[model samples]
Every structure is written in C-alpha cells, then in structure tokens.
Target: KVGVIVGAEQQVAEVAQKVAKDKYGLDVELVTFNDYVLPNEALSKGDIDANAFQHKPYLDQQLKDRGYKLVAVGNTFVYPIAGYSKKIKSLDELQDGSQVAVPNDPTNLGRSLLLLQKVGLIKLKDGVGLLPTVLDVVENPKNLKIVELEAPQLPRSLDDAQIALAVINTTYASQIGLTPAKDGIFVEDKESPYVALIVTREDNKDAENVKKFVQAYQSDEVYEAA
Candidate 1:
C-alpha cells in the first residue's frame, strides 16, 4: 500500500483516495496533517510514502530553507489564495491605513502581496517576482498596514475590528465556511503559478508504488473528483 499524506480539511484528497483504490487498483492509505511544515518533514523522515498538499513554489521555498530532498511527481488542482473580510464587502470599501493581514511564511507572504497588487491595493518593486515581502511595497495609495500573521490565524483575524481584511488560503478559509467564489473579496486566477502537486522524497521518486500513485492521482478519475 502507498501511504499518502495531505493537509487537514482538504476533501479532494479524500476523494482521490477512493479513485486510487477502485480505479487504479492501488491501495492508498490516507494521512492528514494540519501544519504546513509537518508534511514534508514527515515525508523526508520516511513516515509516509508521498504527500499531495502543496504547490510548486511552496515546495521550492521548503527545499531551499529547510534543505529537504523532496520533488513533485505530478500536478494537482490549485487552491488559490484569496483575500477575505468580515468588515468590508469589496476592496473599494477599504479605508486608508487599513490593517491587511497576510500569511507569515515567506512564499505565501509574497503571494498575498501579489494578490493585493493584482487588486490595485498596493504595488511591489519591479521584478521582485513571487517572493516579495511587505518591504517591497513601492507604492501604497491607501497607506495600508500589512500585518503578517500565521496562516491558520488569518481566519480568526477577520473578527478583529482593527483588521480591515486578510489574505487567506482556501484550506483555512473553507474550514470557517468561506469560499473563493462566494466569500472572497479578491482571489487569484487559475493561471497563477501555484498549481498543487503530488510530492515525494527524491530517493523514492522512481519506486513502483510511487509511480502508480502518481498515475492514480493524475488520472481522469482524480481530476473529476477534484
């Protein structure tokens, strides 16, 4: 059996588990993790066969900072990061000096800034690319206060009257009954660079079970399930 790990509340992975079993004839033992840091650590430590929670840029940042020997074996669906708010219905309603919360992790911090830039709320330095930070803000017409918080804390931050808006990952947003299509004030499009992946340690990249697992995840059954 191939043991696959995914993030908590990611229901699509649960669906893919059945497709992996019934359609591909692969036995997939599903594992769920909560924190962003734990899955790669578990996989690298040989606690699981593979993981399917993160995207390419996130994996790149993890490999760079933590020195993990993980590699992406197949693409999965994108769960676009979106800006959510309880105080405001739209970006136009934002006030000057508004407190805008973003994820504290480096890659997602940048992704949040990019979404803000995309909505014309702020501007970043030219060519700073995907890893830009709050310091990279070249222009801020609204004088917005960019608050960096833990990713999981963002959904809770919305109830704070001082926090005008927050950029939240869909994983945490969905937990609180928020969705990109229904609740997001602003959201990243599908063409964004953050497509999710099926990941494995480099040493186990070519194993037979790993290959079959990747095939099962990338199949039409998994696609439809997603």
Candidate 2:
C-alpha cells in the first residue's frame, strides 16, 4: 500500500497504482491525506506501507524532528511553485510597493520567497538556502509588500484589489485554471532542490513488492501521467 498527500498528487498515485498492478502484478493500495504532516506519521506507525508526496529535505526534517525510520526508495517528479498575477501580465509591470501574497506555512513560504528572488524581485541573506523566511530577505528593490496567507487562498488573492501577485504551488494553482507553463509570470526552475520521492519505512525498503512497485512507478506510463 502507498500513501499520498491529497489533490493533484492523488491523481499521480492513481496512475502509479494502475501501473503497479498491470505491469508488475503488484496491487498497490493508495491512501490519501490532506496535510503535509500526516503521511510519515502514518507510515511510521504501520498504518500504511509507503508514501510518495515529499522532497528529500522535507523528509530529512521530518526524520530529524520525529525520529521516524523512513527512507526514500525512488525519485519522483520535480513540481514547481509559480507566481501568478491578474493585475500585471508580466514582471516588468510590477510597481513599487506592490502587495504579493504568499503561503503562511514555512516550507512553501520559503518556496515563494525563493521564486521571487529568482526573478530579481528580491534578494535573500547569503547562504540562507531553501528554507529562508521573510526575515531573510536582505534586499527589496521594488519595496514589495509580502503578505502571508493560507496556501489554498493564494489563487483567490489575485482577485483582491490590493494583491498584485500570488505565489502558488501547482496543486492549488491548477484548481483555478492556472499552470506554471501557461500562466506563471515567474516559475521555479526544474533543477530546483525539491524533487518528490517514493518513501517507505526503513524496514520495508528492500522488500520485493516495494522494489517492484518502485520499478512500476518509474515506468514511462507513470511518467506520462505525472
């Protein structure tokens, strides 16, 4: 069985399950959770066999904080978080002191900030790396006001008169007909550090079924679905 964080990730798991069954004769049971905190907990407690929804850094943090015996068994796709704006068609249109909506959560807040940095909207403190906070911003030439909101509300922030831009991940962005390639004024690089992974309990990492399932998930059919 495998666990996935809900939304667009669930759709990818659905395809992987089909491939696991058809190509590898493995009946992969997919379980879904809404938040980022639960899947590893569930896996550690033996509630599920495996999960596939987070990057290595996130997993490492989880392991460090919770002491869970989990390991990344295979690589998954790299998904991007993008900046969307209804007020401005391009980055060149951004005005000084513009309000930008970003996620309130730590990881995504950093992801949003990093995207802004990548597009020359801001600069971070030296060597702050992927998890830098708003406080880490050392330069703001445009004087952009970063407003933090819940991740799900980012897409709607575009409708607010005050918000000129919103930094949203693909899962929430897709719900509002926005895609990184189609609507993003600025997008995260594909070579980003956040590559998703197929994770399993340390004890089950070498199991026959787990190996077969990883092979099935990495197949071209599953890649196409992703």
Candidate 3:
C-alpha cells in the first residue's frame, strides 16, 4: 500500500487520491497530518510510503534539520500564496504604513515577501534566498508594518490587518469566501518552485507503483479537473 500525506483537507489531496486509484490502479491510502513537522518524521521512519504536502525548499530544510532520508518523487500543483484585503480591493490602494499579516513560518513568510517584491511592493536585501524572513526586508517603500502570525491564523486575522497573505487550501479559502484568482492582489507566478510533490524515501526512487502514480497525477484528465 502507498501512503500519502496531505497538510490540509482539500481537493488537491482528494484529486491526487482519485488519480492514484482510478487511473493508476494503485491501492493508495492517504494519511493526513495537520502539523508540518510530523509528516516528515513519519516519512523518514517509513510510517508512510510517501507524502505530498511540502515544497522543495521546505523539504530540504526538514532534511537538513532532522536528517531524514527523503526525496521528492513527482511534481504537484502550485497554489500561490496570495495577498488579500477587506478594505482595499487592489494593491495600488494600499496606503503607506498599512499593516500586513504574514505567516511566521520561515518558508511561507519569505515566499509571501518575495511575491510582494516581485510586484514592486517591497524590496529585500541582496542575495537573500527562498527562506528569507521579515529581517531580510531592506526596503519598504510604503513603510508597511508586517505582522507575523501562525500560518493557520492568517485567514482569521484579516479584518485587523490591512493586507493578509494567505496560502490557498481550497476548502479553507472557500470557508472564508476568498478565491485566489479573484481576491488576491499578488500571487505566485506560474513558474514558482512552490508546487508540491510526491516525496518518498530515497531508496524507493525506482519503485514502479510510485512511477505509475506520478504519471496518473500529471495526466491531462487531472489537469482538466484542476
């Protein structure tokens, strides 16, 4: 049996599971992990065959920190980390010194800031890479105040903060009535490296079942559903 991890209960995981069973003919079982740290540990210990919840950089950091012998097996879809606001509908309307809330986690916070930088909203220090923090921000043209909060709390804190950066988990976003395509001021570009993946123990890289599942997920039918 192949095991997968999903960070949040959403369609991404649902569709992945569907493709695994229907198209690939694999007996797949999904295990959900609410906490980010536990899934990597589980994967390392062989508790799960693979996981699909994390991006490349986050996986790399987890490996470096915990010494997990895991590797990404296939590419999953990228959901943009987007900027949303209740009072302001557009990024241009954001006033100077506006308070923006971002996830406190290193991977996501930096990614949110990087999205801002890409849109000319802010600037970062030279050579600051993917996992940059608020400290790495060298220039804030509007002098925007960034509030760091837990990742899950961001959607709830929207009313208090002028602009909020939220990760797109379809169900969670739907619950708040926020749509990434319509509500976001700035989102990750199409080529962003943040697309998730099927990750497995390094030694299982050549598994046939794993290859089949990956192929089924990346097929045109899955694309249409997405």
Tell me the lDDT of candidate 1.
0.77
| Model 2, span 1-226: residue lDDT tens | 7788764567677777787888778766678887777889988988788888777777787898889988878877757788899778899898998899997866778777888898888999987666778898889999999988767776877998888999888867777787888777677777456767789999988888888888877878777765
Clashes by residue pair, model 3: none
Candidate 3 residues 144-201, lDDT tens each? 8887776667677666545534433334565678776776545555646675767878
Model 1 regions more than 4 Å off = 1-9, 23-38, 41-47, 66-68, 171-183, 219-221
Best by lDDT: 2
Q: Total backbone clashes of model 3?
A: 0
lDDT (CA) per prediction: 0.77, 0.81, 0.69
| Model 1 C-alpha lDDT per residue in residues 122-218, reported as the tens digit of each score | 8988976677897899889899999987677767789987888999987688777889877877788763656667788899888887787677667
The C-alpha stretches of model 3 lying farther than 4 A from their native spots are 1-9, 23-25, 150-152, 161-183
Error of 2 at 198 (Å): 1.0
lDDT of 3 at 49: 71
Candidate 2 weakest lDDT stretch, 10 residues: 5-14
Question: Residue pairs in steric clash, candidate 2?
Answer: none
